[PDB]
Each structure stands twice: as C-alpha cells, then as structure tokens.
Amino acid sequence: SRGSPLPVLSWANREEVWKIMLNKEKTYLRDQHFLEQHPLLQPKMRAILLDWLMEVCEVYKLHRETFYLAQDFFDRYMATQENVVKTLLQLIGISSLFIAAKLEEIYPPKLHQFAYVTDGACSGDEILTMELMIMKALKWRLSPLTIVSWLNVYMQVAYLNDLHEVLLPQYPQQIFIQIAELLDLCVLDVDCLEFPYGILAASALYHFSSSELMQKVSGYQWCDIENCVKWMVPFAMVIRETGSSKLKHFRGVADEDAHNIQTHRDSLDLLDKARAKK
Amino acid sequence: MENFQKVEKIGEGTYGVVYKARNKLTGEVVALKKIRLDTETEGVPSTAIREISLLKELNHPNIVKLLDVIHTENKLYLVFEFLHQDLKKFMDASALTGIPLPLIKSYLFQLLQGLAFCHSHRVLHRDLKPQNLLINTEGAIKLADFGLARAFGVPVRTYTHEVVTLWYRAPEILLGCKYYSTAVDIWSLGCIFAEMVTRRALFPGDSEIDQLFRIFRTLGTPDEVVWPGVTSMPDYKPSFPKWARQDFSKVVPPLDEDGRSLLSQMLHYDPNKRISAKAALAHPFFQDVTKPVPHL
Numbered sequence: 001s002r003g004s005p006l007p008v009l010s011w012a013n014r015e016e017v018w019k020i021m022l023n024k025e026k027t028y029l030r031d032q033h034f035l036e037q038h039p040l041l042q043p044k045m046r047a048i049l050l051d052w053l054m055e056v057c058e059v060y061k062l063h064r065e066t067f068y069l070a071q072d073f074f075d076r077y078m079a080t081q082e083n084v085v086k087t088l089l090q091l092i093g094i095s096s097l098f099i100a101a102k103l104e105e106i107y108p109p110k111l112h113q114f115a116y117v118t119d120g121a122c123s124g125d126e127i128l129t130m131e132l133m134i135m136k137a138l139k140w141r142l143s144p145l146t147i148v149s150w151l152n153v154y155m156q157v158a159y160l161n162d163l164h165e166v167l168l169p170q171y172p173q174q175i176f177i178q179i180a181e182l183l184d185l186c187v188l189d190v191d192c193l194e195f196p197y198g199i200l201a202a203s204a205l206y207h208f209s210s211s212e213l214m215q216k217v218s219g220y221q222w223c224d225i226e227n228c229v230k231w232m233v234p235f236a237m238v239i240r241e242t243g244s245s246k247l248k249h250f251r252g253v254a255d256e257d258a259h260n261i262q263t264h265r266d267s268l269d270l271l272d273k274a275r276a277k278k
Numbered sequence: 279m280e281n282f283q284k285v286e287k288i289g290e291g292t293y294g295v296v297y298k299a300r301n302k303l304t305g306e307v308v309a310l311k312k313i314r315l316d317t318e319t320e321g322v323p324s325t326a327i328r329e330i331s332l333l334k335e336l337n338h339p340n341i342v343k344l345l346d347v348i349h350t351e352n353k354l355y356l357v358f359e360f361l362h363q364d365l366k367k368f369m370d371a372s373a374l375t376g377i378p379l380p381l382i383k384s385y386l387f388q389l390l391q392g393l394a395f396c397h398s399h400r401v402l403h404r405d406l407k408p409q410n411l412l413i414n415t416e417g418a419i420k421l422a423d424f425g426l427a428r429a430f431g432v433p434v435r436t437y438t439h440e441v442v443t444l445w446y447r448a449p450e451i452l453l454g455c456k457y458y459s460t461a462v463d464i465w466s467l468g469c470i471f472a473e474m475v476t477r478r479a480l481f482p483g484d485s486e487i488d489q490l491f492r493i494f495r496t497l498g499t500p501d502e503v504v505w506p507g508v509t510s511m512p513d514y515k516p517s518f519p520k521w522a523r524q525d526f527s528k529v530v531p532p533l534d535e536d537g538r539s540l541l542s543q544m545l546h547y548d549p550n551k552r553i554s555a556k557a558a559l560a561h562p563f564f565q566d567v568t569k570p571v572p573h574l
C-alpha cells in the first residue's frame with residue numbers, strides 16, 4: 001500500500017486529507033490510447049499542441065498549475081470524443097487553457113488574448129462555444145490533482161522544517177524547476193498517461209534525487225514506480241545531456257515566486273531524441 | 279428546463295438570480311441559480327466554474343447540495359436543494375427576543391462540521407456571512423454560495439487579495455498578508471457567533487479601516503508579542519489607536535466562560551495560533567449537542 005507522507009496537520013486531519021487526495025487519483029481517469037479514437041490524429045500533434053500551450057503560458061506569465069490543468073482537460077476531453085480533425089486541435093487546446101486560467105489565476109488574460117494568440121485560427125465566440133463543449137463533456141469534473149501539484153506536495157514534504165507547516169512554501173526553487181522541466185518533457189508523450197500523475201511526479205523526483213527521498217516524500221514503494229522510472233530514463237538522459245534550464249524572472253512577479261510560472265522550451269527535438277533511444 | 283416550474287425569485291447571491299422552483303415530475307422543491315451568459319464577455323464566469331467544480335467534489339450534510347447543472351440557450355442553471363431562509367433575515371426577525379442559545383450551539387456546531395469538511399478537502403469558502411448561511415425548518419443549517427471559494431494548494435501561493443464580506447474579513451487580509459489559508463474562514467465564523475449572541479454584527483465596519491479599528495477596539499490593538507509579524511505587514515501603520523481587550527463579557531455578555539474561550543480562540547490575531555475547525559469541534563463548548571426546530 002501507500003505510505004502516508006503528510007505531517008500532522010493543524011488545519012485538518014492528515015488521514016482524511018490524504019485519503020481524499022488518493023481518491024482524487026482514482027476517480028480522474030486518463031487513457032494513453034485515446035488517440036486511437038481519432039484515426040486522423042498522431043501523438044506528435046498532441047505534443048505540438050501542448051508545447052504551444054506552454055509557450056502561450058510563458059508569454060502571459062500563467063502558472064504551471066494552469067498549464068497542467070489545461071493538459072488534463074485536453075487529454076480527458078479528447079478521451080470522450082471520436083474522429084476530431086487536426087484543424088480543431090488548436091481550439092480545443094486554447095479553450096482548455098481558457099477554462100484552466102479562469103479556475104486558477106487571480107486575474108487571467110481576457111478572452112481576446114486567448115483568441116489573439118491563435119493568430120486568426122480561433123475567434124472569441126469559437127472559444128466560448130468550445131469551453132462549454134469541454135466542461136459538459138467532462139461533467140464539470142475540473143479539480144484534478146495535476147502532475148505539478150503532486151510535485152508541489154513532494155517538495156513541501158521534502159523540506160519540512162521544525163514548524164511542520166506544510167502550507168507555507170519551504171522548498172528551494174532550482175530543484176523544483178529542474179524536476180518540472182523533466183515532467184514538461186515527459187507530458188508531451190501521450191504514453192505518459194499510462195502512469196498515475198503522482199507516480200510520474202515521484203519518478204521525475206527520483207531521477208533527480210534518490211530512492212530514500214522518493215519514498216520519504218511520496219510513500220510509494222519502489223515496485224509502484226519501477227515501470228514509470230524505467231520508461232522515463234531516456235527523457236531524463238536527454239535533459240541531463242542538454243543541461244537544466246536556469247530560473248527565469250518575470251515582469252511583475254517577485255523573484256521568490258518566479259518558479260511557479262510556466263516556462264517554454266523548444267523541446268520537440270528533445271522529445272524526439274528521447275523517443276528515438278527506445 | 280422544461281422539468282422546472284419557477285415559483286418566485288429568492289434573491290441574488292455572488293452571481294446571478296436564485297429562484298424557488300418545483301421539479302414538475304417529482305414535485306421536489308429546489309433553488310435554481312440562473313447565470314445569463316450572453317451578459318458575459320468571458321463566457322462561464324470563473325466564480326461559476328469554481329462553484330460547480332468544487333460542489334461536485336463536496337457532498338456533506340452541512341453543505342448545500344448541487345443536484346444538477348443545466349445548459350440552455352444563453353443560460354446556465356444550477357439546481358440546488360431548497361432551504362428556507364438565510365441567517366441574516368432569521369436573526370433580524372428574531373432581533374427583539376434574541377436567538378435562544380441552544381440554537382447557537384446547534385448552528386455554530388453544524389457550521390463547524392461543514393467547514394471542517396471543506397478544509398479537509400482543501401477548500402476555502404471565503405464568504406461565510408449569514409446571508410450565505412441557510413438553516414431550513416428541520417434546524418440543520420448549511421454552508422452555501424461557494425462562488426467565492428477556492429481550492430488551495432500544498433503549499434499555498436498568494437490568492438485574491440480582498441475576500442470575505444467586510445464585516446467578516448480577517449485582520450491578516452485587511453493588512454495585506456502575502457499568504458492566507460484556513461484561518462480566514464474560522465475568523466468569519468467568530469464574527470457570526472458573536473453576531474448570533476449580540477444579535478448585532480461584532481465588527482460592523484463602514485470601511486476597510488473602520489473594520490480594522492472595530493477589531494482593535496474589541497480585541498486590543500495587536501503587537502509583536504500577541505502576533506509576531508504584525509509590524510512588518512504591508513498595510514500596518516504605527517499610528518493605530520492602542521485599545522484594550524474589553525473583557526469577554528462586555529463585548530458579548532450572554533456568553534458563559536466557554537463561549538468566551540471558544541470565541542477568543544476563533545478571534546486570535548495570529549492565523550497560526552487561531553483555532554482549526556477540527557479543534558473548535560473538540561472544544562468543551564460542544565458537549566451538549568442540541569438540535570432545536572426554529573420558529574418560522
């Protein structure tokens with residue numbers, strides 16, 4: 001079974017909080033084969049769309065959490081549909097990001113920016129149509145635990161101090177962005193959806209640390225993550241060869257917060273290197 | 279929406295009109311939150327997306343139940359369970375005799391059961407005010423209007439800077455704190471608790487600052503010893519009026535000792551010392567577990 005990594009919580013009961021989180025990992029399903037419902041689509045098309053959403057996120061200083069919400073909304077929406085044509089993918093992705101930004105950001109960009117970045121491919125009204133199509137097809141289940149939120153949990157446990165206050169941010173920035181960069185690479189490959197989000201985050205963490213740390217912060221046993229770890233090896237290789245990106249700073253964002261902002265990597269070639277090795 | 283007959287408008291909450299209405303098939307009585315969408319430049323507003331998605335996750339006897347979400351041409355209806363009135367109209371209808379104190383055990387206990395559930399699900403309500411507190415005829419009382427709620431992360435980051443209706447807003451917010459989480463909801467409940475007894479708002483501020491000073495007058499102006507950090511908070515001014523912690527029998531007489539204890543632990547200045555919803559449930563004060571039918 002799974003260890004309970006959370007400390008004693010002053011604000012609620014750690015056992016209840018953890019069991020709720022684990023049930024969130026159960027009721028939100030992802031399907032590594034959903035593109036088989038779309039015979040005109042290829043996995044590279046998904047990678048190109050998601051990579052472009054990362055670019056849009058960086059231009060607008062959106063949170064990592066917003067990107068991963070959009071990624072999850074896109075993957076689960078597409079699993080509810082059939083026979084989507086490639087000319088619709090931009091609209092589905094940008095509307096997923098619009099929903100996610102409205103959920104997650106304090107002051108999100110306005111509708112007109114989400115249309116603007118598509119460079120004429122999508123109008124505002126088209127985005128308003130698609131957002132309703134997405135939310136209804138997902139039955140309004142719009143509160144997943146994203147990949148990056150699992151990484152946030154793990155980092156907080158890892159650097160818990162005397163205070164046992166898991167809600168105030170206590171982890172250093174560089175480790176967070178480096179693991180995140182590996183996850184941003186992996187998520188571009190639809191095969192990642194084979195692994196639960198908490199195992200993807202634990203496996204990326206592992207490739208940047210040790211089994212001791214992985215088990216300490218996630219409660220997984222090595223056999224739980226072994227296949228994911230093995231799958232991730234070439235992506236970790238490509239990142240290590242290329243070297244980790246440095247912390248960027250952002251206009252209007254305090255430097256101590258800048259690690260929370262999604263960055264963009266021209267890493268579709270990295271993705272190809274990683275998959276070529278298999 | 280052919281299966282719903284609107285009875286009467288019930289009021290406007292955080293977004294759009296609420297209606298009393300009847301399920302034509304079963305005769306069930308429901309509240310209908312309407313959202314007109316062609317009024318909205320951004321499509322489905324973020325408050326509605328948050329409320330719907332949070333309430334699909336939250337099923338508790340002390341949280342109003344979201345029954346359905348219906349989309350018709352330019353409109354979005356949220357079908358909720360029916361309750362009978364908010365606590366602000368109940369309070370002020372019983373504002374002469376006061377509200378009998380066994381119901382104030384009942385209502386503060388149930389409200390804490392709800393909030394403890396929200397917080398274990400990592401949801402901040404951020405608008406616990408009696409107009410959003412529904413109490414029905416069986417007596418139960420339910421948290422409602424999650425239009426201002428937010429799921430908080432582990433760890434949190436900076437969220438929306440001015441939240442909770444002013445009479446219920448916590449001091450850390452008024453001073454522009456970088457981080458807040460569950461304490462802000464507990465504060466709100468204290469303001470409501472004393473508002474039940476005094477049958478009058480504990481801090482009926484007319485302004486941001488007036489709300490701050492109502493708090494200082496009643497609890498004493500805080501300092502680096504009662505709340506370590508106050509002096510380094512953004513909206514802290516040295517010029518504030520040093521006031522005295524008026525005994526917890528003046529600011530609120532009907533209370534016994536435990537009522538004073540609980541309430542003061544809920545109005546602790548330091549969010550990090552302030553009591554959790556779980557702990558408030560374990561306070562002696564909730565040893566007699568009364569559940570009276572109200573007058574309506």
Ligand SMILES: CCS(=O)(=O)c1ccc(Nc2ncc3cc(Cl)c(=O)n(C4CCCC4)c3n2)c(C)c1
Nearest residue numbers: 289290291296309358359360361362363364367423
């Ligand atoms: C002038 C107010 S009153 O006392 O006449 C009155 C108040 C409440 C209710 N009932 C009720 N039942 C279920 C919901 C579900 C939701 Cl989501 C909701 O928002 N509200 C209301 C709360 C805030 C505005 C709408 C509900 N209200 C009634 C019948 C009268």
